[PDB]
């Protein structure tokens, strides 16, 4: 019961980390296109 | 102590596999001991991990011999044995998880579903269909094929031909493991052959030559010819001769359901054609089917969707269009929508691997 | 008691999601970086080709460049003097005048109507007897 | 130098809506104060994504074709995918030998 | 570029210490040094460039219409591109091009569909 | 089979048929539920009817039916309603799962209901049926007498009254059991509950419950008063200490409170001591003099300092950029910190004659790092060099005041006033860069001395330096208002500061007011939310950079998901090069308590595009993983160390060193290479100025305070926060326009020490101590599981790892009164025979009285 609280913190941190990776990849697809235009 | 309890469980499983037909003398004589090892909550006692060292196929073989009124020999006439077993398997499902432990989960739903198909109703079936759907990466190739085999049979009864057609084709793919080159393959094959006939027709038996015995092949040829010629008299006779097969499968209903397709197929073969169509020419064609009901059968045809045509019975001539020209009917649009699903769904699983 | 078990599943699930995304993330990330390096390279005046006339033992070399006149330039420290030799064709930076690689040696009678023909196809049976 | 300093259908439709809406408001005002052809081509012409309807017949045929082209591309992505699965499959295999 | 000459009593008082630049300033007294290039502009400029770069919105409608006109040719060349593409993959057995080659074709269809 | 027979009878439509079909239905619902589902309308209708007689049985069946579908909440409604036929002291697997679901439901209503009114709990006002189960679940676990399971649940369902009662009834003084349970619940409430309003309530109560027992655990009692940071809690505690009066215990407690607590807190604590008249001893402790002096005494004897390393380092580089001169003035201060020896600087004077203005100010300010730890010899040393006395430049006189402000932070009471007189004086003079450098130190010092209380007098003085608009001095004043008002600012102060950033047209003053704004919200949490928006709502780069530090500081300690989401979000979605680096730096402060998690969050980001990002992750780990020696932190920092981009090498080198301070060859095989690497980089010419700055200062970290200190953002001696240290590292982490500002690392050195302190001789024994950690897997650097018997001595280098297995010898001439406790920090003895010394030494407060 106490345990779950510990584990919920690890789960939450991880969840945000995953959503943040998704978002970063988006800026990169964008970056790619822009870089091809510049070259 | 711990190691000894895991060992204890391996020894009961092992014993239970041995005392069957597989690795020992005759399954029925042995059944009572096989049942003693299951029953007094030693199966329960196994919960160190999930059931996947004993499998649904195995629980199936012991329970069928116990009870089916043909191996039991009307030993008892009650499904008292199965009711306790189904309940206990149901009791397992509650504490089963779906996300990472669905090895035990699919197997239990397989055993329960099976019993409904053996003897039950097509009404209660709906809930079991919805519960079943769980990843197909967790269960063996052998176990996946059996899961599809039962699902496909259930879908046929509802008259979902298409869904069963996909599951069956996937079911019988490759053979890295047995019961996709054995007796199980032949059972699958018969059910696949039936599902294609239901859709319209099966006109290929190339694969089936090599994966089925001669006794099966003859009835497959007789059916496909009856349905292709359109001739009801040959079809009926095919059921009559291979009465023993249709009974065996436990599905004499198929005969009743398919026969309607044959008379529908006959009316179709000679299309709509010319802009006015003579009564006589069509009468001749309908006479084959049933000859004292020319006007009724043609009326039934139009409502049904066998044909679409426009009738005068104060002139007694038939008017038609003949369409062989395929303009757009949302047909690009449909392609696109399908493709976005096809690419994403495929794409994600391939990526995980 | 049911509740603790459910939290343990959702973690296990999440990690696989991290593993998949991470692997793709890297592929894109590399591509931007690759393109940047390529862009630094695509800014250049080129390297001049020259012929090493002779090497001086004080770390000059005498080069006749084909682009220009004749020049004294500073031997590179990316190559050693025993790679260089008389009549070597080299690539030397127009930027830094450092001999960065060696091509091949050249000649002039070999293209003034004298020529090599390795392993000839004539036999004694050809004009036999 | 400009570029060094600095380093869809809907937006146009919303503008369109606002002009029409403004135009109506003006026409009401204009009658009140007072007590052709351009407006007349701006109503009947568009009555029939609206215009694009009449065109849809021709669009559709080419629309199958360009769809088939995207489908070949999906297959192509699957093909590339299979190589990735093998690469992972190889690594695992070498780790087991070792 | 921007360069200025060095001044004494400033660029030694500001930026062992700098032995080099210290002998340089007691020496020459003036010598070139490079000054950084930056920009500063207001928000008002920044907003009202990006509605020029009305022409862009109205120009965007016009462009969509005339694109559908030219699509007859643009169709045919992607058909060709694909034939090369498939042939290429055969010879290898390149892959990279094909993927880039696949992505591009997807982008173009998204555009073709949007037009109409 | 079929339930179709049973259901046929239900439709007949009388009382008997309802009851028979019900009692049949209960048994095999679960398997036949499918068939029964269609008659679930009749069952619910019977539910809230009573034309029949079956209601509570009907609700029961319905629960079972709903259950089998997968509608758990739906089943839960009816399970409750079944009333008398449903019991939670009877368990099946079915029962377990809907009690579980009933708690979840209860949790949901309780989250919402606490936010709404914070005495929801003092009455039933929620669903009675749920409440009934809830009390009874609590009783069950507790009758079985495991108290961690019951307390876990009571937390979760956000009601305080259950927590109080539950614990209370089972406090039976055993004593061992009461203490241990209460210590578990305290740790829990802090780490896992960031519902700040709820968490405080549990803390204040758990404090009075432990306090009321005749036996207490005084270490745990100090934790909670530091956390809630109240003088009022302090006063109740001390009057309890009056009843059981012992000079050893009361003294220990003051040695704890002085370090951890804030300046203002300390101040009301002297006032209350003065007015309670209880112990004049303790009031001197509360002035901080004893603890710092004891450390001095330790550092002078256990120093291992080498000027040959600084000599080697300087000759390894070549001068051509004043960045190198800073590097060695600074590595020297750090290395020789607390040992009161200026030795290097004393030895080499011609290079000093070369040095630019800033480099002079830094040389002068290095004395301050060394002479920290003296609050009476601190002032004395700097007297020949002040304004009005000797020096050789006014930049040298300016650094004298910067160095005084370094030392006398944490007890700046005199020095703030003293410095203020210099501020008001030199506001006229700005005609020469000689005065701008003087007034620049002046502003640093005053901000540093007045930290942790908030004197508006200092704020108003530094602000007129902005109106006079002097280019160097305005940077120090701006940052200085932020330091002074830290965590105790006016709302007005925020608004005035915020407007002035916008007004100022000098780059440096704008930079200093950005960082200035972040500091002033320290520890606010949600209360800072208004300012976060405002900094990001300014479309200035400096202000958006400044916004990121404001979350790190406000949400520090125990981490908060909302806070990490916002910072990661700016890091990903903002493309501005300052902004991305600051938002990654910022994660490390949030995450100091939960430091394990920082290599995973920053895993990705370390291999991610743009060097500023990669720089930011080095810092994140450096701040967060400092002192622990996390094996995962080091593995991430290795690639970055030989990265092409020079300031990336630099920051990773600084970072590695902070984690691995006072960790040795053999303990870690890897450090030998690392030290090699630091050395090789200075010596090669192929590195650039920024990379060697990173390298020089990195040696300087490892070798800091004569090898005896670690860098931590809390105490070990209470195990609760230490403000100074946190603040120090955020100024430390930036250097980009902040070329002299390295010096803020003096405040982050904590000594790694276990020494005994005689209660009435105030002296250090030198005696042999026992240990079970393997010595000679500890060594003298430069110039694993254990239980094996071993030895260590007193006044020798106690490492983090070592501290855990050491034990005071009990049986020479002293009693160690509360004993050692398995963490760093002193323990006060009270002597059996003070009057013969065992092998004592004289401390430095007895060399200067």
Swiss-Prot record, chain B:
Keywords: Acetylation, Phosphoprotein, Proteasome. The modification Phosphoserine is found at residue 329. GO terms for biological process: proteasome-mediated ubiquitin-dependent protein catabolic process; regulation of protein catabolic process; ubiquitin-dependent protein catabolic process. One of its GO terms (molecular function) is enzyme regulator activity. N-acetylated by NAT1. GO terms for cellular component: proteasome complex; proteasome regulatory particle, lid subcomplex. It comes from the Eukaryota. Residues 145-325 form the PCI domain. The 26S proteasome is composed of a core protease, known as the 20S proteasome, capped at one or both ends by the 19S regulatory complex (RC). The RC is composed of at least 18 different subunits in two subcomplexes, the base and the lid, which form the portions proximal and distal to the 20S proteolytic core, respectively. Belongs to the proteasome subunit S3 family. Present with 16700 molecules/cell in log phase SD medium. Acts as a regulatory subunit of the 26S proteasome which is involved in the ATP-dependent degradation of ubiquitinated proteins. This is 26S proteasome regulatory subunit RPN3. It comes from Saccharomyces cerevisiae (strain ATCC 204508 / S288c). The lineage of its organism: Eukaryota, Fungi, Dikarya, Ascomycota, Saccharomycotina.
Curated annotation (Swiss-Prot), chain C:
It is found in: Cytoplasm; Nucleus. It comes from the Eukaryota. N-acetylated by NAT1. Present with 4700 molecules/cell in log phase SD medium. Belongs to the AAA ATPase family. The 26S proteasome is involved in the ATP-dependent degradation of ubiquitinated proteins. The regulatory (or ATPase) complex confers ATP dependency and substrate specificity to the 26S complex. May form a homodimer or a heterodimer with a related family member. Interacts with OLA1, TMA17, and UBR1. This is 26S proteasome regulatory subunit 8 homolog. The lineage of its organism: Eukaryota, Fungi, Dikarya, Ascomycota, Saccharomycotina. The chain holds residues 24 to 152 of 405 of the full protein.
Swiss-Prot record, chain E:
Component of the lid subcomplex of the 26S proteasome, a multiprotein complex involved in the ATP-dependent degradation of ubiquitinated proteins. RPN11 is the only catalytically active member of the lid and serves as the essential deubiquitinase of the proteasome. This is Ubiquitin carboxyl-terminal hydrolase RPN11. Component of the lid subcomplex of the 19S proteasome regulatory particle complex (also named PA700 complex). The 26S proteasome consists of a 20S proteasome core and two 19S regulatory subunits. Interacts directly with RPN8 and STS1. Present with 16400 molecules/cell in log phase SD medium. It comes from the Eukaryota. The JAMM motif is required for the deubiquitination and degradation of ubiquitinated substrates. N-acetylated by NAT3. Belongs to the peptidase M67A family.
From Swiss-Prot, chain F:
One of its GO terms (molecular function) is enzyme regulator activity. InterPro entries: 26S_Psome_Rpn2, ARM-like, ARM-type_fold, Proteasome/cyclosome_rpt, PSMD1_RPN2_N, RPN2_C. PC repeats lie at residues 362-395, 399-436, 441-475, 476-510, 512-545, 546-581, 582-614, 616-650, 651-688, 694-730. Keywords: Acetylation, Phosphoprotein, Proteasome, Repeat. The keyword Acetylation applies. SUPFAM superfamilies: ARM repeat (SSF48371). Coiled coil: none annotated. One of its GO terms (cellular component) is nucleus. GO terms for biological process: proteasome assembly; proteasome-mediated ubiquitin-dependent protein catabolic process; regulation of protein catabolic process; ubiquitin-dependent protein catabolic process. Pfam families: HEAT_2 (PF13646), PC_rep (PF01851), RPN2_C (PF18004), RPN2_N (PF21505). N-acetylated by NAT1. Acts as a regulatory subunit of the 26S proteasome which is involved in the ATP-dependent degradation of ubiquitinated proteins. Interacts with UBR1. Present with 4750 molecules/cell in log phase SD medium. Belongs to the proteasome subunit S1 family. This is 26S proteasome regulatory subunit RPN2. It comes from Saccharomyces cerevisiae (strain ATCC 204508 / S288c) (Baker's yeast). The gene is RPN2.
């Amino acid at each position: 019961y106490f345990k779950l609280k510990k584990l919920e913190k690890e789960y939450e941190l991880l969840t945000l980390q995953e959503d943040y990776i998704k978002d970063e990849q988006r800026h990169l697809k964008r970056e790619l296109k822009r870089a091809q235009e510049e070259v | 102590k711990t190691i000894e309890v895991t060992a204890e469980i391996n020894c009961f499983m092992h014993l239970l596999v041995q005392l069957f037909l597989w690795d020992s003398k005759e399954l029925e004589q042995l059944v009572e001991f096989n049942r003693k090892v299951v029953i007094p909550n030693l199966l329960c006692y196994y919960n160190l991990r999930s059931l996947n060292l004993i499998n649904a196929k195995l629980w199936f073989y012991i329970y069928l011999s116990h009870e089916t009124l043909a191996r039991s020999s009307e030993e008892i006439n009650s499904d008292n044995q199965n009711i306790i077993l189904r309940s206990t398997m149901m009791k397992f499902l509650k504490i089963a998880s779906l996300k990472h432990d669905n090895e035990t989960k699919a197997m239990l739903i397989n055993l329960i579903l099976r019993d409904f198909l053996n003897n039950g109703e097509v009404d209660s079936a709906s809930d079991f269909i919805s519960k079943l759907e769980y990843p197909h990466t967790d269960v063996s190739s052998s176990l996946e094929a059996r899961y599809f085999f039962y699902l496909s049979k259930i879908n046929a009864i509802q008259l979902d031909y298409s869904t069963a057609n996909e599951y069956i084709i996937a079911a019988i793919r490759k053979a890295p493991h047995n019961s996709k080159s054995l007796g199980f393959l032949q059972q699958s094959n018969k059910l696949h052959c039936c599902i294609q006939l239901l859709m319209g027709d099966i006109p290929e038996l190339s694969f089936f030559h090599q994966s089925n015995m001669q006794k099966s092949l003859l009835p497959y040829y007789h059916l496909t010819k009856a349905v292709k010629l359109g001739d009801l008299k040959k079809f009926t006779s095919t059921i009559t001769k291979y009465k023993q097969l249709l009974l065996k499968d436990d599905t004499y209903q198929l005969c009743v359901r398919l026969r309607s397709n044959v008379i529908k197929t006959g009316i179709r073969i000679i299309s709509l054609t010319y802009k006015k169509i003579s009564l006589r020419d069509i009468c001749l064609k309908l006479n084959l089917d049933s000859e004292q009901t020319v006007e009724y059968m043609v009326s039934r045809a139009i409502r049904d969707g066998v044909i679409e045509a426009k009738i005068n019975h104060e002139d007694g001539f038939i008017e038609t269009t003949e369409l062989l020209n395929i303009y757009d009917s949302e047909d690009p649009q449909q392609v696109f929508d399908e493709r976005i699903k096809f690419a994403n769904q495929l794409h994600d699983e391939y990526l995980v691997s | 008691e049911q509740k603790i078990q459910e939290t343990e599943l959702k973690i296990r699930s999440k990690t696989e999601n991290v593993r998949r995304l991470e692997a793709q993330r890297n592929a894109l990330n590399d591509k931007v970086r690759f393109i940047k390096d390529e862009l630094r390279l695509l800014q250049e005046p080129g390297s001049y080709v020259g012929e090493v006339i002779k090497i001086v033992s004080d770390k000059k070399v005498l080069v006749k460049v084909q682009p220009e006149g004749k020049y004294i330039v500073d031997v590179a420290k990316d190559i050693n003097v025993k790679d260089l030799k008389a009549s070597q064709r080299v690539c030397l930076r127009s930027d830094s005048y450092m001999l960065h690689k060696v091509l091949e040696n050249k000649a002039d009678p070999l293209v003034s109507l004298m020529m090599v023909e390795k392993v000839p196809d004539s036999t004694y049976d050809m004009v036999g007897g | 130098g400009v570029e060094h300093l600095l380093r869809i259908r809907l937006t146009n439709q919303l503008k369109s809506l606002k002009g029409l809406q403004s135009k109506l408001k003006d026409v009401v005002e204009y009658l009140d104060k007072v007590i052709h052809t351009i407006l007349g081509k701006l109503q009947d012409v568009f009555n029939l994504n609206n215009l694009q309807k009449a065109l849809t017949v021709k669009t559709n045929d080419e629309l199958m074709v360009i769809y088939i082209s995207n489908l070949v591309r999906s297959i192509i992505a699957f093909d590339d995918l299979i190589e990735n699965k093998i690469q992972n499959k190889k690594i695992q295999e070498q780790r087991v030998k070792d | 570029d921007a360069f200025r000459l060095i001044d004494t009593g400033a660029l030694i008082n500001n930026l062992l210490n700098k032995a080099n630049i210290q002998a340089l300033i007691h020496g020459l007294n003036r010598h070139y040094y490079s000054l950084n290039i930056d920009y500063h502009k207001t928000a008002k400029e920044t907003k009202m460039l990006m509605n020029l770069h009305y022409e862009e919105k109205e120009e965007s409608n016009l462009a969509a219409t005339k694109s559908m006109v030219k699509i007859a040719e643009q169709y045919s060349k992607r058909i060709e591109e694909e034939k090369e593409l498939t042939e290429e993959e055969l010879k290898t057995r390149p892959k990279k091009h094909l993927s880039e080659t696949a992505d591009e074709t997807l982008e173009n269809n998204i555009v073709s569909v949007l037009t109409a | 089979t079929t339930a179709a027979p049973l259901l046929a009878l239900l439709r007949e439509n009388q009382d008997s048929v309802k009851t028979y079909a019900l009692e049949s239905i209960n048994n095999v619902v679960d398997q036949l539920w499918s068939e029964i589902s269609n008659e679930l309308p009749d069952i619910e209708a019977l539910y809230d009817d009573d034309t029949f007689s079956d209601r509570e049985m009907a609700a029961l069946i319905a629960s079972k039916v709903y259950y089998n579908l997968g509608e758990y909440e739906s089943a839960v409604k009816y399970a409750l309603a079944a009333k008398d036929r449903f019991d939670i002291d009877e368990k099946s697997q079915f029962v377990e799962t809907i009690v579980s679901k009933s708690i979840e439901m209860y949790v949901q209503e309780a989250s919402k209901q606490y936010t709404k009114d914070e005495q929801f709990y003092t009455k039933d006002i929620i669903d009675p049926k749920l409440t009934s189960i809830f009390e009874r679940m609590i009783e069950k676990c507790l009758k079985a007498s495991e108290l961690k399971l019951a307390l876990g649940i009571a937390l979760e369902g956000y009601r305080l009254d259950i927590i109080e009662s539950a614990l209370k009834s089972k406090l039976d003084q055993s004593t061992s059991e009461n203490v241990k349970i209460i210590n578990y619940l305290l740790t829990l409430a802090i780490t896992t509950v960031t519902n700040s309003k709820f968490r405080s309530s549990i803390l204040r109560k758990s404090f009075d419950f432990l306090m009321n027992m005749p036996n207490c655990d005084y270490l745990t009692l100090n934790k909670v008063v530091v956390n809630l940071n109240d003088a009022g809690l302090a006063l109740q505690l001390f009057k309890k200490l009056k009843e059981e009066n012992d000079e050893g215990l009361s003294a220990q407690i003051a040695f704890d409170l002085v370090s951890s607590a804030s300046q203002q807190l300390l101040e009301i604590l002297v006032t209350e001591l003065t007015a309670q008249g209880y112990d004049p001893a303790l009031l001197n402790i509360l002035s901080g003099l004893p603890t710092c002096d004891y450390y001095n005494t330790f550092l002078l004897n256990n120093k291992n300092i080498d000027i040959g390393l600084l000599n080697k380092s300087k000759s390894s580089l070549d001068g051509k950029f004043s960045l190198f001169h800073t590097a060695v003035s600074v590595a020297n201060g750090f290395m020789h910190a607390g040992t009161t020896d200026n030795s290097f600087i004393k030895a080499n004077l011609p290079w000093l004659g070369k040095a630019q203005n800033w480099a002079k100010f830094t040389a002068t300010a290095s004395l301050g790092v060394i002479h920290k730890g003296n609050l009476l010899e601190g002032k004395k040393v700097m007297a020949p060099y002040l304004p009005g006395s000797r020096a050789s430049s006014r930049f040298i006189k300016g650094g004298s005041l910067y160095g005084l402000g370094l030392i006398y932070a944490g007890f700046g009471r005199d020095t703030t006033d003293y410095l203020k007189n210099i501020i008001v004086e030199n506001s006229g003079t700005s005609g020469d860069e000689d005065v701008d450098v003087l007034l620049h130190g002046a502003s640093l010092g005053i901000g540093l001395a007045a930290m942790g209380s908030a004197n508006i007098e200092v704020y108003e003085a530094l602000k007129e330096v902005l109106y006079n608009d002097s280019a160097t001095s305005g940077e120090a004043a701006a940052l200085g208002m932020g330091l002074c008002m830290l965590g105790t600012g006016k709302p007005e102060a925020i608004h005035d500061m915020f407007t002035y950033s916008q007004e100022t047209q000098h780059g440096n003053i704008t930079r200093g007011l950005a960082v200035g704004l972040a500091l002033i919200n320290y520890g606010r949490q949600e209360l800072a939310d208004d300012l976060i928006t405002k900094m990001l709502a300014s479309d200035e780069s400096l202000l958006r950079y400044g916004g990121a530090f404001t979350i790190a500081l406000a949400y520090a300690g125990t981490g908060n998901n909302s806070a990490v989401k916002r910072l990661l979000h700016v890091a990903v979605s903002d493309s501005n090069d300052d902004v991305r680096r600051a938002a990654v730096i910022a994660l490390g402060f949030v995450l100091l308590r939960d430091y394990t998690t920082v290599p995973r969050i920053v895993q990705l980001l370390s291999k991610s595009h743009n060097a500023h990002v990669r720089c930011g992750t080095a810092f994140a780990l450096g701040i967060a993983c400092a002192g622990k020696g996390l094996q995962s932190a080091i593995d991430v920092l290795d690639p970055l160390t030989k990265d092409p981009v020079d300031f990336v090498r630099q920051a990773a080198m600084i970072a590695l060193s902070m984690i691995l301070i006072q960790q040795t060859e053999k303990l870690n095989p890897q450090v030998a290479d690392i030290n090699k690497n630091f050395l090789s980089v200075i010596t090669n010419k192929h590195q650039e100025g920024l990379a060697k700055f990173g390298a020089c200062v990195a040696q300087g970290i490892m070798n800091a305070g004569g090898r005896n200190v670690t860098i931590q953002l809390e105490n070990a001696d209470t195990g609760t926060l230490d403000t100074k240290s946190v603040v120090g590292l955020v100024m430390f982490s930036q250097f980009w326009y902040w070329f002299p500002l390295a010096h803020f690392l003096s405040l982050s050195f904590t000594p790694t020490t276990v020494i005994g302190i005689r209660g009435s001789d105030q002296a250090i024994p030198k005696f042999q101590m026992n240990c079970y950690a393997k010595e000679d897997a500890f060594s003298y650097p430069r110039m694993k599981y254990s239980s094996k018997p071993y030895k260590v001595d007193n006044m020798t280098r106690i490492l983090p790892q070592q501290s855990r297995y050491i034990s005071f010898i009990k049986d020479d001439r002293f009693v160690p009164v509360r004993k050692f406790k398995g963490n760093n920090g002193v323990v006060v003895l009270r002597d059996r025979e003070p009057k013969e010394p065992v092998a004592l030494i004289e401390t430095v407060r007895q060399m200067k009285d």
